[PDB]
Structure formats: C-alpha cells, structure tokens
C-alpha positions as CSV (number, residue, x, y, z in Angstrom):
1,X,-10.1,8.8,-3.7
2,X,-8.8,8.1,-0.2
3,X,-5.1,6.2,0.1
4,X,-3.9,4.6,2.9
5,X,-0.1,4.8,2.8
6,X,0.8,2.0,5.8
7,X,4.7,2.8,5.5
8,X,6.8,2.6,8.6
9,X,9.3,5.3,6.8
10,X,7.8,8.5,6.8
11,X,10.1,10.3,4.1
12,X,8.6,7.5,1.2
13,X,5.1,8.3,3.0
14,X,5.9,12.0,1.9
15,X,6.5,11.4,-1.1
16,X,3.2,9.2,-2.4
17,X,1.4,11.7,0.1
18,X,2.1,14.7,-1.9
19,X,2.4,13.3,-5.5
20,X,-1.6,11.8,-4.7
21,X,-2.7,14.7,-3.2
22,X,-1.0,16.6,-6.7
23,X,-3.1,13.9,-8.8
24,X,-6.4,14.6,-5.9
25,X,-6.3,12.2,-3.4
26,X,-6.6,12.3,0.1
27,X,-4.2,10.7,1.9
28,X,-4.2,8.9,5.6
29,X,-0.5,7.2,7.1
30,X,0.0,4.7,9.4
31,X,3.8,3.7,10.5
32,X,3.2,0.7,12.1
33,X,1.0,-2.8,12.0
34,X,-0.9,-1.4,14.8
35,X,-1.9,1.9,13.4
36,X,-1.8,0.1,9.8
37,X,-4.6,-1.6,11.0
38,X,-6.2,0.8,13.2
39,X,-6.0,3.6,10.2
40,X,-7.4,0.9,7.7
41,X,-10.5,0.4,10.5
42,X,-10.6,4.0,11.1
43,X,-10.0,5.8,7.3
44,X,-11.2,2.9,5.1
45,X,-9.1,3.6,2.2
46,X,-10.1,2.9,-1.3
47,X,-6.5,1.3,-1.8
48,X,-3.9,0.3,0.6
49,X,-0.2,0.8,-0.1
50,X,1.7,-1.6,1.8
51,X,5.5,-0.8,2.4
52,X,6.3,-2.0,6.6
53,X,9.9,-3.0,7.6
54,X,8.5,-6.9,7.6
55,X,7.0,-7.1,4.1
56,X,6.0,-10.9,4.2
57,X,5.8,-11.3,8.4
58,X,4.5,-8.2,9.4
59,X,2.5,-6.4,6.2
60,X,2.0,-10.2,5.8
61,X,-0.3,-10.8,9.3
62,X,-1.1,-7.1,8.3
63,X,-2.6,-8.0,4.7
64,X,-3.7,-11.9,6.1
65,X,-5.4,-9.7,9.0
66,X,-6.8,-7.5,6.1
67,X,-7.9,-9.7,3.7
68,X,-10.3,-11.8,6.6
69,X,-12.6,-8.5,6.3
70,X,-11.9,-6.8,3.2
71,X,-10.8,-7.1,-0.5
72,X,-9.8,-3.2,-0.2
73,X,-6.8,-3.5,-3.4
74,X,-3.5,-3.8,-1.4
75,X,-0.9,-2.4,-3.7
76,X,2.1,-4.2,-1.9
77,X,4.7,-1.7,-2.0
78,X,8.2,-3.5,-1.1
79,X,11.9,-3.1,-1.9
80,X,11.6,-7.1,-2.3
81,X,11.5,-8.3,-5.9
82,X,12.2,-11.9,-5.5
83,X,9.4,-14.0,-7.2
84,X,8.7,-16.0,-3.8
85,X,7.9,-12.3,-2.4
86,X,6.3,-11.5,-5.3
87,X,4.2,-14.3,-5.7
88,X,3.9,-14.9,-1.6
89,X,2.6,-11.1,-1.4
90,X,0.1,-12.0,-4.2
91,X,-0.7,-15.6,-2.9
92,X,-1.5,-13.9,1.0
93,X,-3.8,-11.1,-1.2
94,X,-1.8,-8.6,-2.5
95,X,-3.7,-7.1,-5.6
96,X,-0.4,-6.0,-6.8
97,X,3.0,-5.8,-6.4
98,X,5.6,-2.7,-7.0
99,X,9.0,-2.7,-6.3
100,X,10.4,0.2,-4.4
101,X,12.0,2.5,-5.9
102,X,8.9,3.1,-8.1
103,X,8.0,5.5,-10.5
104,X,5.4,8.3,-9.6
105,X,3.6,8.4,-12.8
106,X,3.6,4.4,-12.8
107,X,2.4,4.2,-9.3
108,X,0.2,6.6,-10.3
109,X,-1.0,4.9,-13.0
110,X,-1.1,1.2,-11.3
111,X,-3.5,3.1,-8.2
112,X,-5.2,4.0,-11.2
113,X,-5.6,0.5,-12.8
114,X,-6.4,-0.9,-9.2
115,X,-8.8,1.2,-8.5
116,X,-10.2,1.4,-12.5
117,X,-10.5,-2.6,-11.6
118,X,-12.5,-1.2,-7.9
C-alpha cells in the first residue's frame, strides 16, 4: 500500500516513512504544495497524509485542489485541534483528522481503517 506523506518537515516525514515501511508500505514525500501536488499526480497514493505549514490555506487549496479529481482518503495530519480546524479540514474533504503528536500504532491503525473503508 503506497502513502503519500505531503509534510513540509522532513524529520515527522521520517518518522511515518519508516514506521510504514516497518508495517509494508511504500512510501513517496513531498515538502511543499507544489510537489504535494505533483507527487499526488505523479505516485498516486492509496492515502494522503496531510501535514504542510498552512493546514487550512495551503493543505486547504492542496486538499480543495485534490478533492476536484480524487476521493484518494486524506488523513489530515495537523498540530491544529480546534473543532473549526477539525471540522473545516473535514468540511473541505478531509477523510480524517489526527492531531500531531500522534501515536504510531494509532496512525497505524487509522491508515488502516481509512484504507479498510478504501
């Protein structure tokens, strides 16, 4: 199963990219809208974990720009909690929303329920 971690921190990135490739995945990164979006046209993840700088403005056009082609599950990774972000990143498409810090097992398991749902 393929993961695109978009993440514009590359330690975090590290850190999903080698607990998923310990569970089997593959894992692409992008750091940026740009390559967000060119990695999601070019890899094609089965899920998306979305974790830029701009949650709501930038992963925001990023998931808006997303969701006109594809209902690929975004797993909205974001150190926001607030219920507007939470139900914003869900009301723009977000499949689901985890708060950073996150729990590997958890993430693991959610990735697991998004795609079990896929």
């Amino acid at each position: 199963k393929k993961i695109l971690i978009v993440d514009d921190e590359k330690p975090i990135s590290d850190i999903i990219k080698f607990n998923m490739t310990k569970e089997g995945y593959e894992v692409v990164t992008a750091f940026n809208g740009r390559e967000a979006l060119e990695q999601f046209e070019a890899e094609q993840p089965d899920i998306i974990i979305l974790d830029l700088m701009l949650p709501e403005i930038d992963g925001l056009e990023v998931a808006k720009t997303i969701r006109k082609t594809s209902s690929v599950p975004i797993l909205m990774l974001s150190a926001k909690d607030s219920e507007f972000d939470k139900v914003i990143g869900l009301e723009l498409g977000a499949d689901d929303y985890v708060t950073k810090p996150f729990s590997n097992r958890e993430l693991q398991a959610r990735v697991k329920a998004l795609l079990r749902r896929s």
